[PDB]
Structure 1
Amino acid sequence: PLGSMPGFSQATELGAWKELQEHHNSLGRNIVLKEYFEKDPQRFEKFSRTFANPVDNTEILFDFSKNFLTEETLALLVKLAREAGVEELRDAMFKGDPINFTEDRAVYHVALRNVTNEPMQVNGKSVVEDVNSVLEHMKEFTEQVRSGEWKGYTGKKITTIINIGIGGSDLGPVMVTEALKPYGAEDMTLHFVSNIDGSHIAEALKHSDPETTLFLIASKTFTTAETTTNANSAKKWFLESAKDEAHIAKHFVALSTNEEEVTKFGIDKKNMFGFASWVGGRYSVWSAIGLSVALYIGFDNFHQFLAGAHAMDKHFRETPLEQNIPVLGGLLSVWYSDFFGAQTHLVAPFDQYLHRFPAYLQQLSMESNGKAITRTGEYVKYTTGPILFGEPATNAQHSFFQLLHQGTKLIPSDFIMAAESHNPVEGGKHQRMLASNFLAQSEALMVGKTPEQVKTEGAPDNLVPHKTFLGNRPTTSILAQKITPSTLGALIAYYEHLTFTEGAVWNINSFDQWGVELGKVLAKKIQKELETPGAGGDHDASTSGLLLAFKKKANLA
């Protein structure tokens, strides 16, 4: 049950951290990328890494060489990882130890994709059979729905899937079905309802037929406020057509473990797909929460998605730190965040199907590492998780890359592309152009354009500063073969273990989220006040004034 004291308290107390500060002061802050490339023709070989995807038998190239790194920098960052016990915490997580120390819970999303059925246990009880049982249930169900064997209450094939859930019950399913759309069933329409704002469920239902719509109600407790309200509104709409509550069981399933609330809702207990307490929402697309993915692309493709993550898990678990890809990604984030003062982290996929990949990573990263209390209960003496943001390129280029190239912020940036398109329009011309931007953007950010080059091209002398690009703006480039299910699984797992590495160095809990509870408590209180004539004055003057303005504009007593 109880375990050891943490290995350290504050990251700033580790000797390697102090060495990194001295390294920054003397050298790191003076790194000029184009000078290092001029002087070291082997720089790309030194700081690139290749990951083999054994599922689709391809390779993903991770190029870190346009980052603020020397061989000495890398040595010190790996030293910091060792002093912070990154490998020990990682091994604890894979053993099923309760490394989520504020909730006394294991952290076992890695067990969800344990496709080789390696021994995995929590509390000295294997989890493998239970994980596999749910997956088999998911397989059977998706086969039934996709084949048309599962029929609506009037005997029709299901053609609309409507997922209802918040946060991690929504963002993964959205992003993965969008990313893997070429694998999706041609006759299937998916809606993802998540906001409590009634516009969301309304637009989803407006263009759906109760006779051919299947609802997935995603909530471990089946008492999540927003999801319960959306789920109830969906049921009301359904019954307005189906009338008999017995038909619910053909049109609603539950991604949940609260069998009492599920059956009370009207769902047959045989149609709950459970996921464990040690599955965090932002780490849950691999679990029953992925059922909408398996419905859309088929179970075999979902399993390949799992297996790609598993190949990345193996890389993370077995690779020495110097060559360990997610570990280097995490250490770079610490380096930029805590020694260069970068408050943000850009991720830009040169891939339109991945348009919701940055929003997914934003929850993974910021909800994990937006923390300030160490394992020892102290307030951190250094900044933790960045604001993670992005849009797909080339759209992002035409929106905000102006600031990336000529603004006054250091913005560590990850660019991601597949070498092959699922839609090679016009003899590959679109894809060659996409590729040219992927390659040129990192080049441009690194080399810039000197005032001398600018003037050489004929610029008015007094516009030269406006057209100068300082360069020396770092990037990481990730080149996959093709975005298949397994390659996507490996890419997500990269960012999961990057996020793990950050939190291990910072000595924070990447796996709780106590920071969401105050808003929920205060919202429920205010909701009762909105429902209560004359109430709403027990707040600060701003909240009271807004609440009153709202009551007046919305016609509430």
Structure 2
Amino acid sequence: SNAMLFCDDSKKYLKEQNINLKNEFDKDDKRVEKFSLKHQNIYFDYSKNLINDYILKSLLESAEKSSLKDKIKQMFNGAKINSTEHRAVLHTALRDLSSTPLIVDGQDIRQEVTKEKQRVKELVEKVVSGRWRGFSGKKITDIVNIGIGGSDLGPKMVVRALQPYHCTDLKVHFVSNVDADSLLQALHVVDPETTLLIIASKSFSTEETLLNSISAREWLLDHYEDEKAVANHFVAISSKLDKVKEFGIDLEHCYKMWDWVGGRYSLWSSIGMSIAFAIGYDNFEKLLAGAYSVDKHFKETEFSKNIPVIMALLASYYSCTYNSQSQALLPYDERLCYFVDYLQQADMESNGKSVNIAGETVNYQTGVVLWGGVGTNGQHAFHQLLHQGNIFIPVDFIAIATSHHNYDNHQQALLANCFAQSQALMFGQSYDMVYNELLKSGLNETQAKELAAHKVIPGNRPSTTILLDELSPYSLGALIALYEHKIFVQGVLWDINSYDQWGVELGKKLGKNILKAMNDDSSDEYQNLDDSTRQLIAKVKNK
């Protein structure tokens, strides 16, 4: 295509600068000032990355020469930047506070977002206040969200992350996998007379959600033995109005899903109602507002001071020039235990693409594996490989300055460990240092010589630390939005469509064919199987 090539020959010459982090911090008393940014109460420290002024300048020039400035405007204005589906990409509009005019494919987006939020707010208030009653007349005590992917991970992550803010006296449960263990974990602990279930399914056709929904309905009706009970116990987030009505849900309680909201960008929409059912609508608004803060930052700030742009440039630089194939994300807070899982979908489902916008196969690597784990626990699981393995892996740390309790010694130790692990990545420890330490420990020269090489830690390994003041609805919204925009920037620089997901279609089709084969070994489906699939089906049956 005619697009600027990001991963070009010039990028390799940047890495020949041979950056040594210890030397840079020693020589440059402005290093932190140069390579850190603030947005409100988020501090973004990228100074332990393998950059200097020349490398950063070069990368920023690539951003400036690219289509990025135009693409940011196009996203926010509702241009159809999801070019394979001919759709706008307007998750930003879900959290807008600017109130500027936005008319897209005939709809006043401001009015439609606002009116839908009012419907959800009113639902949550009616349920929490006890005005909503189940079919036997009882107040609701439990909410069960039924959805998968986009319709599960964001709500589940946010509900956990904001646990200190739970305030509705409702318990919220998440059913997702078609594996019935998921449904059963909820059903074992809820009462049909006091439970409200949410079916989150755009087309009412996602297989797992359909089976879970039907099985939930059967459970409810086994209790009540009256079809009319569905209306008091189920709501839907769907566009498939006929199937929602056929299930027995009142269309007053069918909530909107717009085509310009990708599933993996949908927690901000009515899909997030389970968040509001846990933390109340006021806190859901604060979540939205935090994201807006970052949207305004991203939209308005010159690239050299723009956090998501810097995040994207660093990531793409590493995966281009060091040929790295993964990135580690290390949240140093228990509350963020589903954060990595959530961003795996946002990042990998967006940028795991092999063709550009024009449909040409690209000759450079695109999205890499995102993985990681909560700290300090990861220090005792996989940090060994981060320190002494021989895989190049960029590392992001998320630190939270203050927690939600008064165990101040624990919080101090948590932070000290976070900072110590980035410092260890930067400095390492050399043979001479180790050898001298072993002698001082009481080993003799022979013993110290035999052991020291095994303790050497190469160091000079990069990291970024993102420090939040606290983990509140607002700050979490800001955090998630930073990564949403990082992912957007990377897709623009790689000239891919971050907003489609055609790769998942084949497995859905093959799954239907295999289900048919499992039920009828005379079928064309069974006959056409590869023999691996055929013998796996046989092993299952002859159990």
Q: TM-score, normalised by structure 2?
A: 0.96
In the alignment, what sits opposite 2:444?
none
Aligned pair 1:544/2:524, yes or no? no
Q: Which whole-Å CA distance do the structure 2 matches of 1:450 and 1:175 have between them?
A: 41
Q: Which whole-Å CA distance do the structure 2 matches of 1:141 and 1:186 have between them?
A: 13
Stretch moving more, 325-334 or 450-459? 450-459
Q: Which whole-Å CA distance do the structure 1 matches of 2:380 and 2:341 have between them?
A: 19
> Residues 347 and 413 of structure 1 are in contact (CA less than 8 Å); yes or no, is this contact kept in structure 2?
yes
> Residues 521 and 527 of structure 2 are in contact (CA less than 8 Å); yes or no, is this contact kept in structure 1?
no
Per-residue CA distance 1:454-508 (angstroms, 9 max, x = gap): 1221252211111111111111001100011010000000000000011000000
Q: 2:422 aligns with which of 442, 452, 465?
A: 442
Q: 1:390 aligns with which of 334, 347, 372?
A: 372
Listed as ranges, the matches of 1:197-276 within 5 Å are 197-276=179-258
TM superposition shift of 1:186: 6.4
| AA of the residue aligned to 2:129 | S
In the alignment, what sits opposite 2:442?
none
Q: Which whole-Å CA distance do the structure 1 matches of 2:133 and 2:105 have between them?
A: 41
> Residues 115 and 306 of structure 1 are in contact (CA less than 8 Å); yes or no, is this contact kept in structure 2?
no
Aligned pair 1:43/2:31, yes or no? yes
TM superposition shift of 1:76: 1.0
| AA of the residue aligned to 1:8 | A
Aligned pair 1:140/2:122, yes or no? yes
In the alignment, what sits opposite 1:55?
none
Q: 1:280 aligns with which of 262, 286, 306?
A: 262
Per-residue CA distance 1:257-312 (angstroms, 9 max, x = gap): 21111111110000011120010000000000000001110001001100110010
Aligned pair 1:308/2:290, yes or no? yes
Q: Which whole-Å CA distance do the structure 1 matches of 2:134 and 2:201 have between them?
A: 23
Q: Which whole-Å CA distance do the structure 1 matches of 2:241 and 2:250 have between them?
A: 9
> Residues 201 and 236 of structure 2 are in contact (CA less than 8 Å); yes or no, is this contact kept in structure 1?
yes
In the alignment, what sits opposite 2:20?
32
> Residues 10 and 380 of structure 1 are in contact (CA less than 8 Å); yes or no, is this contact kept in structure 2?
no
Q: 1:529 aligns with which of 503, 507, 517?
A: 517
> Residues 330 and 398 of structure 2 are in contact (CA less than 8 Å); yes or no, is this contact kept in structure 1?
yes
In the alignment, what sits opposite 2:131?
149
Q: Which whole-Å CA distance do the structure 1 matches of 2:227 and 2:530 have between them?
A: 46
TM superposition shift of 1:443: 0.5
Q: Which whole-Å CA distance do the structure 1 matches of 2:87 and 2:5 have between them?
A: 23
Q: Which whole-Å CA distance do the structure 1 matches of 2:72 and 2:9 have between them?
A: 24
User: Which sections of structure 1, spanning at least 5 residues, go unmatched?
Assistant: 1-5, 53-58
Q: Which whole-Å CA distance do the structure 1 matches of 2:138 and 2:482 have between them?
A: 41
> Residues 4 and 65 of structure 2 are in contact (CA less than 8 Å); yes or no, is this contact kept in structure 1?
no
- Relative to structure 1, the CA distance from residue 479 to residue 280 in structure 2 (aligned partners, 3 Å threshold; closer, same or farther) is same
Aligned pair 1:196/2:182, yes or no? no
TM superposition shift of 1:11: 3.8
| AA of the residue aligned to 1:480 | L
Stretch moving more, 37-46 or 365-374? 37-46
> Residues 9 and 378 of structure 1 are in contact (CA less than 8 Å); yes or no, is this contact kept in structure 2?
no
TM superposition shift of 1:10: 4.7
Give the superposed CA RMSD: 1.3
> Residues 168 and 280 of structure 2 are in contact (CA less than 8 Å); yes or no, is this contact kept in structure 1?
no
> Residues 4 and 66 of structure 2 are in contact (CA less than 8 Å); yes or no, is this contact kept in structure 1?
no
% of aligned pairs identical? 46
Runs ≥4 residues deviating over 6 A? none
SS of structure 2 residue aligned to 1:353: helix
In the alignment, what sits opposite 2:79?
97
SS of structure 2 residue aligned to 1:177: helix
Per-residue CA distance 1:69-101 (angstroms, 9 max, x = gap): 111111111111122211111111111000001
Q: Which whole-Å CA distance do the structure 1 matches of 2:405 and 2:109 have between them?
A: 40
User: Which sections of structure 2, spanning at least 5 residues, go unmatched?
Assistant: 440-447
Aligned pair 1:472/2:460, yes or no? yes
> Residues 176 and 209 of structure 2 are in contact (CA less than 8 Å); yes or no, is this contact kept in structure 1?
yes
SS of structure 1 residue aligned to 2:334: coil
Per-residue CA distance 1:349-370 (angstroms, 9 max, x = gap): 1000110000000000000000
> Residues 288 and 477 of structure 2 are in contact (CA less than 8 Å); yes or no, is this contact kept in structure 1?
yes
SS of structure 2 residue aligned to 1:483: coil
Q: Which whole-Å CA distance do the structure 2 matches of 1:124 and 1:336 have between them?
A: 42
SS of structure 1 residue aligned to 2:458: coil
| AA of the residue aligned to 1:144 | K
Listed as ranges, the matches of 1:268-417 within 5 Å are 268-417=250-399
SS of structure 2 residue aligned to 1:466: helix
Q: 1:18 aligns with which of 6, 9, 31?
A: 9
In the alignment, what sits opposite 1:68?
50
> Residues 244 and 251 of structure 2 are in contact (CA less than 8 Å); yes or no, is this contact kept in structure 1?
yes
| AA of the residue aligned to 1:498 | K
Q: 2:488 aligns with which of 478, 496, 500?
A: 500
Aligned pair 1:456/2:436, yes or no? yes
Q: Which whole-Å CA distance do the structure 2 matches of 1:351 and 1:244 have between them?
A: 46
Tell me the matched-pair count: 533
Q: TM-score, normalised by structure 1?
A: 0.94
Q: Which whole-Å CA distance do the structure 2 matches of 1:298 and 1:115 have between them?
A: 19
